């Protein structure tokens, strides 16, 4: 989850 969120949120 967090890996996906962090990637998403940085973009």
């Amino acid at each position, epitope marked *: *989850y*967090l890996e996906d*969120w*962090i990637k*998403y949120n940085n973009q």
Partner: antibody
Amino acid sequence: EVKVEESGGGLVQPGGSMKISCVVSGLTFSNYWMSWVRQSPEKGLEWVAEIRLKSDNYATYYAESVKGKFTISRDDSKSRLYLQMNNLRTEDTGIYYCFLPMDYWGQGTSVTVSS
Amino acid sequence: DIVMTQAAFSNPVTLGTSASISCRSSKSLLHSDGITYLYWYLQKPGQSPHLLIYHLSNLASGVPDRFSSSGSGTDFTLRISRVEAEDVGIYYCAHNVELPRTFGGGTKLEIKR
């Protein structure tokens, strides 16, 4: 500011269906994960469904409560999120919010399931 | 699933004094990036929730400096340092570390007058 506005609530009988939606303005809708969160006395704030982006093949996620009953979808061209809600029970009564995690909530649209 | 625990009510607070609203989570919300993914929302009567704090202690844009927050990975506290009458409402905690997203049951602020 960013504005989230739901519509489509009303009454339906148990075992029936509803389809609600929200339009989001003030940002580029297609670039955001979007969710539905409902509110009721018994269960308080309850996240029910979520959808990611075209680049994620529109991956969807559901709370166990509603798996098999609800389908979330998005039309990026209309900046619109949908929730198709089938085989409803009285406990599906509540105020339904679009929530753009983690920043933005709509005004809510009310859904009553009753005979 | 993470359980977020909040008391339904707080001790009534006199205007101009400090109120503390607590929350705890059943799992640590501290991530390996050093961020604790704990959020606070306020829902005023007749309204939707609105974001106050993100990542444990950061104020959302336009939120007054009267609001602050800290915590561990599991126990968190929102402070309203000089309460005003308009702050009445229900304050909710939420995590952002996994799905399903879950919320605390909400703590209603009562003003003492």
